[PDB]
Amino acid sequence: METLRVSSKSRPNSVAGAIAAMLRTKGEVEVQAIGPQAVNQAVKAIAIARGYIAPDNLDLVVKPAFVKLELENEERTALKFSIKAHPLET
Amino acid sequence: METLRVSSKSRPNSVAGAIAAMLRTKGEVEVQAIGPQAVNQAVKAIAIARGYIAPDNLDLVVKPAFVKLELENEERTALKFSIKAHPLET
Ligand SMILES: [Zn+2]
Ligand SMILES: [Zn+2]
Ligand SMILES: [Zn+2]
């Protein structure tokens, strides 16, 4: 899945737009978040994204998971959200 | 759905056991969270729960959404996670 990295300052609506575009084009995307606020921003973005892909006959499902990631040569534990799209009607 | 309301002070590991128990028995559960910390605890709880049901060749899928909830005499926008059991895949 291509990866969208989210931070404490990321804006849910702009991230939601990106998620929506990746789901519409590739059918899946992953969001990586580290820290409380970033996780909150990511979840909000995913909920908003559902509203953008619905008119395109799509909804999404998410699977959260803990993952160890490298950042600034440091190893950090983060939360990753694997997101998949599927048609609402076929 | 049965509902679990997570607090900023909830222990992810305990909530995860509640989630796993419900998914195994009913195959679905809803988790509600109001503030950023509670949202973080919920996401961590859902991620740990995946490990609790994986043995049984079962995984889960989540769909987050905004929802208006009543807390005493106040209406509050919260986040809810609809969680459904999904028998595992390869
Ligand atoms: Zn550092
Ligand atoms: Zn109040
Ligand atoms: Zn009202």
Secondary structure of B19-81 in the HEC alphabet?
HHHHHHHCCEEEEEECCHHHHHHHHHHHHHHHHHHCCCCCEEEEEEEEEEEEECCEEEEEEEE
Count of C-beta atoms within a 10 Å radius of residue B43 = 30
Give residue B70 CA to ligand 2 midpoint distance, Å.
11
CATH number of the domain enclosing B51: 3.30.110.20
Give me Rg for the CA atoms of chain A. Answer: 13
**Technique used:** X-ray
Query: For the residues of A34-50, what is the DSSP string, one character each?
Result: -SHHHHHHHHHHHHHHH
Domain count, chain A: 1
**Which phi and psi angles does B66 have, rounded to 5°?**
-85, 150
Distance from CA of A18 to the nearest CA of B (A): 17
Cβ B29 vs Cβ B4: under 8 Å: yes
Q: Which residues of A touch B39 (CB under 8 A)?
A: 39-40, 43
CB atoms B50 and A63 under 8 Å = yes
Domain that residue B78 falls in: 1-90
User: A43 burial class (0-12, 13-18, 19+ CB within 10 angstroms)?
Assistant: buried
Pairing of strands B28-33, B74-86: antiparallel
The 10 Å CB-count burial string (b at 16+, else e) for B1-38 is eeebbbeeebebeebbebbbebbeeeeebbbbbbbbbb
